[PDB]
Design a protein around this ligand. Structure first.
Ligand SMILES: CCOc1ccc(C(C)=O)cc1NC(=O)c1ccc(OCCN2CCNCC2)c(C(=O)OC)c1
Ligand SMILES: CCOc1ccc(C(C)=O)cc1NC(=O)c1ccc(OCCN2CCNCC2)c(C(=O)OC)c1
Length: 102
């Protein structure tokens, strides 16, 4: 019930123009080296699956999961890569919205 704003963030991030790298889990078969570099994958649909089924005890580890998305993105992709550029936009969107609400 305090995750009222978490679904608003998630719903806006899902529909955001720059969300295309994070809408489904990275497919390690198509992304060379992803499996070995990123040991805790996270993506918006997994956050969706987890939020619906209810496993977010506070807005705290919602943010932890979102921040994991953008931390994985910066670990794996160069800042000037196409996926990197989208990640930065998504990460600033998230930070921006999160402080607008908390
Ligand atoms: C090449 C580097 O690939 C990555 C390297 C690193 C990372 C991360 C997150 O670190 C991410 C990615 N790529 C993606 O996520 C990603 C996702 C979807 C894509 O299209 C699927 C089209 N499909 C979508 C749903 N509706 C129907 C059509 C493509 C693509 O077609 O690219 C060729 C790439
Ligand atoms: C090259 C690495 O690409 C990825 C890297 C990472 C990831 C993820 C999710 O992690 C995903 C992807 N790509 C996909 O899933 C994916 C799916 C379908 C695709 O075409 C089918 C569509 N069809 C009809 C319309 N016209 C074009 C051809 C293509 C593709 O290559 O289009 C040229 C890619």
């Amino acid at each position: 019930s305090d995750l009222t704003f978490c679904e608003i963030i998630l719903m806006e991030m899902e529909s955001h123009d720059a969300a295309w790298p994070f809408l489904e889990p990275v497919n390690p078969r198509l992304v060379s080296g992803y499996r070995r570099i990123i040991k805790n994958p996270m993506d918006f649909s997994t956050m969706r699956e987890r939020l619906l089924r209810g496993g977010y005890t506070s807005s705290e580890e919602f943010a932890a999961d979102a921040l994991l998305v953008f931390d994985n993105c910066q670990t794996f992709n160069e800042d000037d890569s196409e996926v990197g550029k989208a990640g930065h936009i998504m990460r600033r969107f998230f930070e921006s919205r999160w402080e607008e609400f908390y």
